[PDB]
Write a protein that binds this ligand. Structure first.
Ligand SMILES: OC[C@H]1O[C@@H](c2csc(-c3ccc4ccccc4c3)n2)[C@H](O)[C@@H](O)[C@@H]1O
Ligand SMILES: OC[C@H]1O[C@@H](c2csc(-c3ccc4ccccc4c3)n2)[C@H](O)[C@@H](O)[C@@H]1O
Ligand SMILES: *Cc1c(COP(=O)(O)O)cnc(C)c1O
Ligand SMILES: *Cc1c(COP(=O)(O)O)cnc(C)c1O
Lengths: 809, 809
């Protein structure tokens, strides 16, 4: 059908159809008269997986023969989403499979919707891991993703009476055809026990053993015939475990609970034992695997052969575990072991929010990991000895830089451990990396300036353009060819088409097509009726006070009050769509969802409003819903308080897919505005410097309430029960926080946000100038490819050269 | 190689080799340089499974078109063992697969040893279910086995310091290639709740829901192209289950515990809630499946279309569940529902031991299954109304026949429920069926004589001759052809070869070959050295007081004491092998294992004994060890106290495989001796009548101790610590039971057992007369085919005609 989906040759189609019917019979044990659409999906998944296998085996063999330096990406989260379409895209099989399924009287798009998301992540950090695996395979790096195979991923969100309800994400119920169990590479992980000091050094004894069973998932590069591995560990009890009889067998579940469920907190630390167990489990099993592979090629060459990247502090125990193995088991002396650890490990920091920083109570580590605590104390002593020698007399610096925090309960600062034990520390956007050097890690920067880098985040243009927006990919490919899909900088060639009438028409047509398709999706799957000629105002991301969905709520109520004030005046019609999950224990995030649905209940049923303003809560926001709504979006809301969003990656997905951005100078918004030009971006609100000035004199929200009549009216409506008639006080906690305890200064940005939103409506009234500004955004989105990000990690941290050369098929 | 293993045609071998390499690459994602023997086993298993699929789909389609009467075999136990060799035997693929694997430089026998036993049973009852599925497929019955997919089967037995240790049987660790998950046929099962009485009848409300997910395993018939289904249910929590958040997800394990583990008690009732849950779970899910299939063809025709066979009382709740569905959900009146239930259900009783009878406390049923208890009370009232009308004034009969037992705690007699609710009640050997009518069910027999039948147990000659003893199968097939494998009565043709020198030579040669192979197996796998020219004296079966492994221990010690008394006299050398598992909580059974190993420790290290007497405890006795040891056996020990072994099936396996039997007139021993002639059987000990006479005057063990010097010496040796030097009192519980609390009268049979064992040694000294007696046993074993048993169930209980006609391939 469309060129970027590849060829449908007669031989390929015949062969796919034959293998589809072979899997339906032999694999699924079904004839055509009893097959459900789910059987058809599985037959196709098995058929496409077959094309991966040769390339996967040859790629792993190629890395054994060439023995390049190996990259180990350690994350507690991989937000993969669906695998079927992505595999077809990267193997150029999409048109052939479309043709093959069509000739069997099946619709491939209907079969694609049956696949469960692998929702093994919360949001940005988990999805960044997924984008990275894709870029590492596309750039031909010998890279392995290592994580946990959670039985239950991020919970399914149901809205019930406008409230979030959580259901278990039973994503493995029907089987996962993409994974291969490797029970033969099962490894022991130890917990509890105690330390004996012998003549021959320290001994970790009387431990409980949990087994780590690996599951391998193929990660195909973009048409380069490279297939890398994501290895996820599953917890299994040993068979002597507890071994009255019946209860001992049932108690095996205590050990297997380690890999049962993903902690659903985004940017919030919860010091739970089960979470520390998950962290050690993935680190212990992964480091044994790394060392085993290294010995099958003296530890001086280890850092020439191994890079370990830490996705935040979640796998920070990699540093003490590497020391423990090298000192206790391999009998290297401390200093040599430490040289090897630092040259091997690099640390990516993802937030400055202090509630997100991992600070593990010492009593937890003492009980669960007594040897690691000893090694952490030793690391701290030697580290503070270097601080004292560099800053003699600066006793306050010693307290601030300690890995050990004094107070009510002694805690380990896992970020301090990562900086001490890593040769490189990076933030995830330039403003974030500058804030790390100026504020939270200023002391560490003064000691070791050379360690601190920036690696601005990115997204894979395979999932986030070719896969989710084939219509846009195609009209681009018509003018500048297909090379941009693995070289996104080539999108700059589109700036020479900004005054081309045909290209303007095509860009606007694809947007309209995407909006019609998404409006229909809403009607079928959720019986809701939206005007597809309205501006699609989209804020999708986890529900958090710092992301200021509440600021968006204040704008929506302002538009409502303006319409009711002057019902017969023209306003640009908008559909305001807000979606995202709240962490189950985050009361305020749960109240914000309820406010969004309560506003919708008033706004969507007011006959005076008409189809001029619709407010929709998008339920169960996840990777597969992002692929549908982002190509449909006109306006991207990136409205975090300046200094709180380390980078963001949603911002980039929308820029790539033909939405204009309204945003603060926060995270990667700053670099996006710089790439496109400030004149092609709806920037508003306090900069970082303005927020600091407000903090010095003190944030008084009352001042804004007293001076802005439009704002006072909204707050009185919230308080009085305008939006909750049956429960007049329902939103008293929201009003109370906004007036007295707002860390994120929602009122301070209100006036400038509303005024900037008027400029958006004004430009939307002029379709041609809207579309020309969109072209200027798409054309400058190239920097925000994860291929650029990963090439920067490869050259400046890992010391390996990316390659775009094909392996032989 | 040998004819009964089928043809190895060039095309077949080429095709198997091609599909083996296809599965190794595509299914296992392995090249030949990294493949382990386990990968090779899996490649072959997938290759053979491929040949099942066409026949499985066609057979299920044939039953849909022809709509025959359906047989539902309900059991809590299916003791399947390994599937690979059995599948090859029944598809005639064994020689082709032997050839195919040989040409790839692999040994198929080495690959077969990598398969885990499906140990989803305890012993005889579980293995009888497995033999039956094989016969039902071979006789072309539209039959379904329904059970529980236990995550953990019967525990692996380790011997540590001569003591039994249990380990979890993690049989699914590496995957089960034989099963197909059918998550689309998932069904809800209800527990707890309460009963509302409406105007429109009773309503079971406020229940907890567990899901039953079925796994289908193919059951191939013998070369008839029929493949029946074994459907096993797995427990899954619903996704709203408990749905703070983390703990709700972890608590899903409470519901999934239902299918976690097989209760490891053989002939012992334990009234545990989890066990009652397993019983209801398999019954509820199975009856919904049966009714669904029936509606996809008015309940008058239900018994013309459905037979439900109950494997003991374990699924007795099928009777109240069928009533509950028919009355509460389908709105039939009581009397019609009851007519349908009785005509559908038949009950097989397997024991007379009172500790084996299921008597569920009312408080358990009241809480877990309140509606079933109401229906059971109603059944009891109507049943006792029929008893009172037939036996007016006999108030004692009313108390004895009640489904409800009065006492400390009220209990439901599940056997009484099964007799009341079933059109047929059978025992499992003629003597057992006579004992049911004379003693434990005498009152039920007088009310409904027509219900009571015999169906003498049998074994499948596929697993138990062709598969485990190919050498014997072949020398038989040389003289009388292959037809006997599905018509075992044809073995009578062997009586005309009892004086043929060549056949005598071949029978003795196969036995010798089997003994050499098993002696080597002992050396490799367990570093033990046995004389293969000794008599192989084998007692293998679960460890139980009624099976009198202790009587065998007394004989072994008697031989030891006789050798030590007269060291320089000739005795027929014996290897005494005893094997079996004790239930983990059965103290006495655990002490007996320890006595066996303690005797071995004295006997096997006495230089005066030499290789004249060896005592071996065979560790981890299970179906795959039975396939090795039974063909190696000379003497089969079937030495249960008369009246305790309902049938036995080990007895039959040994008769078929060329061992002579030493046994009591118990269970099927009686019919085996009748088939072969008493002169070709080593019968000893009390008959049932003699045991009754001993009970009337009272069993005084002291009398035997006082009158038999050889016995007194053994008891003094046990007491004094001859067999436990470090712990002189180790066996005081054994001596104490034998002297004062022996329910099974071990001393009463001692003299006759030892004398009969001398007759065995005497006949073994004459190889030609030993082998002629063996031929008389093999030649008369035809009755003990499960094909005969299942044809008798089919004609006299289920009302269907068996068929030996092939489906088209
Ligand atoms: O770099 C990828 C994205 O990371 C997000 C980010 C920062 S901390 C965090 C996170 C995610 C999951 C967590 C689970 C347990 C404890 C702490 C956690 C912190 N996620 C940041 O908030 C985004 O700005 C950024 O784009
Ligand atoms: O008919 C098959 C065989 O059944 C055996 C037999 C009788 S009761 C029983 C059994 C097995 C497992 C059980 C689990 C829980 C509660 C009671 C149970 C009873 N097994 C009998 O003991 C054997 O004689 C007979 O050959
Ligand atoms: C990209 C993505 C995110 C991250 O979005 P931000 O706006 O950067 O917070 C979260 N969830 C999903 C499903 C995503 O695809
Ligand atoms: C046949 C069999 C049994 C039953 O043997 P009995 O001697 O009748 O108790 C028990 N276990 C296994 C493994 C069997 O194969």
């Amino acid at each position: 059908q469309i060129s970027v989906r590849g060829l449908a040759g007669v031989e390929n189609v015949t062969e796919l159809k034959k293998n589809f019917n072979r899997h339906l019979h032999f694999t699924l044990v079904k004839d055509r008269n009893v097959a459900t659409p789910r059987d058809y999906y599985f037959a196709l998944a098995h058929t496409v997986r077959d094309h991966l296998v040769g390339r996967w085996i040859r790629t792993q063999q190629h890395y054994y023969e060439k023995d390049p330096k190996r990259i180990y990406y350690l994350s507690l989260e991989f937000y993969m989403g669906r695998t079927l379409q992505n595999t077809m895209v990267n193997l150029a099989l999409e048109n052939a499979c479309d043709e093959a399924t069509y000739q069997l009287g099946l619709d491939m798009e209907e079969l694609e919707e049956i696949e469960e998301d692998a929702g093994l992540g919360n949001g940005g950090l988990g999805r960044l891991a997924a984008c990275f695996l894709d870029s590492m395979a596309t750039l031909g790096l010998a890279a392995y993703g290592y994580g946990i195979r959670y039985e239950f991923g991020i919970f399914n969100q149901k809205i019930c009476g406008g409230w979030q309800m959580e259901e278990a994400d039973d994503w493995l119920r029907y089987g996962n055809p993409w994974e291969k169990a490797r029970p033969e590479f099962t490894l022991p992980v130890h917990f509890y026990g105690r330390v004996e000091h012998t003549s021959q050094g320290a001994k970790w004894v009387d431990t409980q053993v949990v087994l780590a069973m690996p599951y391998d998932t193929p990660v195909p590069g973009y048409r380069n015939n490279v297939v890398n591995t994501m290895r996820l560990w599953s917890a299994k009890a040993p068979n002597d475990f507890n071994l009255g009889y019946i209860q001992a067998v049932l108690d095996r579940n205590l050990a297997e609970n380690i890999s049962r469920v993903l902690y659903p907190n985004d940017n919030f630390f919860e010091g739970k034992e089960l979470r520390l167990k998950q962290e050690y489990f993935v680190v212990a099993a992964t480091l044994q695997d790394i060392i085993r592979r290294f010995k099958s090629s003296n530890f001086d060459a280890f850092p020439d052969k191994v890079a370990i990247q830490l996705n935040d502090t979640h796998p920070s125990l990699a540093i003490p575990e590497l020391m423990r193995v090298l000192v206790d088991l391999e009998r290297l002396d401390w200093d040599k072991a430490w040289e090897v650890t630092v040259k091997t490990c690099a640390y990516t920091n993802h937030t400055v929010l202090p509630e997100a920083l991992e600070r593990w109570p010492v009593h937890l580590l003492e009980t669960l990991l007594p040897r690691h605590l000893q090694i952490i104390y030793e690391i701290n002593q030697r580290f503070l000895n270097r601080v004292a020698a560099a800053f003699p007399g600066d006793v306050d610096r010693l307290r601030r830089m300690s890995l050990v925090e004094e107070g009510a309960v002694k805690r380990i600062n896992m970020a301090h451990l990562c900086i001490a034990g890593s040769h490189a520390v990076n933030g995830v956007a330039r403003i974030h990396s500058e804030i790390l050097k100026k504020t939270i890690f200023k002391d560490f920067y003064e000691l070791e300036p050379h360690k601190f880098q920036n690696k601005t985040n990115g997204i894979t243009p395979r999932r986030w353009l070719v896969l989710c927006n084939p219509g846009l990919a195609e009209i681009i490919a018509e003018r500048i060819g297909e090379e941009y899909i693995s070289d996104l900088d080539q999108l700059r060639k589109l700036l020479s088409y900004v005054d081309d009438e045909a290209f303007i028409r095509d860009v606007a047509k694809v947007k309209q097509e995407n909006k019609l398709k998404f409006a229909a999706y809403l009607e079928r799957e959720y019986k809701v009726h939206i005007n597809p000629n309205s501006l699609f105002d989209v804020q999708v991301k986890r529900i958090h006070e710092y992301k200021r969905q509440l600021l968006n709520c204040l704008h929506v109520i302002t538009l409502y009050n303006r319409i009711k004030k002057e019902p017969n005046k023209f306003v640009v019609p908008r559909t305001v769509m807000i979606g995202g999950k709240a962490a189950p224990g985050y009361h305020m995030a749960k109240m914000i969802i309820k406010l969004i649905t309560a506003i919708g209940d008033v706004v969507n049923h007011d006959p005076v409003v008409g189809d001029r303003l619709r407010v929709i809560f998008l339920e169960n926001y996840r990777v597969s819903l992002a692929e549908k709504v982002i190509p449909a979006a006109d306006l991207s809301e990136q409205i975090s308080t300046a200094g709180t969003e380390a980078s963001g990656t949603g911002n980039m997905k929308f820029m790539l897919n033909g939405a204009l951005t309204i945003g603060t100078m926060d995270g990667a918004n700053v670099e996006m505005a710089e790439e496109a030009g400030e004149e092609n971006f709806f920037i508003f609100g306090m900069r970082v410097e303005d927020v600091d000035r407000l903090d010095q004199r003190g944030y008084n929200a009352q001042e804004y309430y007293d001076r802005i009549p439009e704002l006072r009216q909204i707050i009185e409506q919230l308080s009085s029960g305008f939006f909750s008639p049956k429960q007049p006080d329902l939103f008293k906690d929201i009003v109370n926080m906004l007036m007295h305890h707002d860390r994120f200064k929602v009122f301070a940005d209100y006036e400038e946000y509303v005024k900037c939103q008027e400029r958006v409506s004004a430009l939307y009234k002029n379709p041609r100038e809207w579309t020309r500004m969109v072209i200027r955004n798409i054309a400058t989105s190239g920097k925000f490819s994860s291929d650029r990000t990963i090439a920067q990690y490869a050259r400046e941290i890992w010391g390996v050269e990316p390659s775009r050369q094909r392996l032989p098929a």
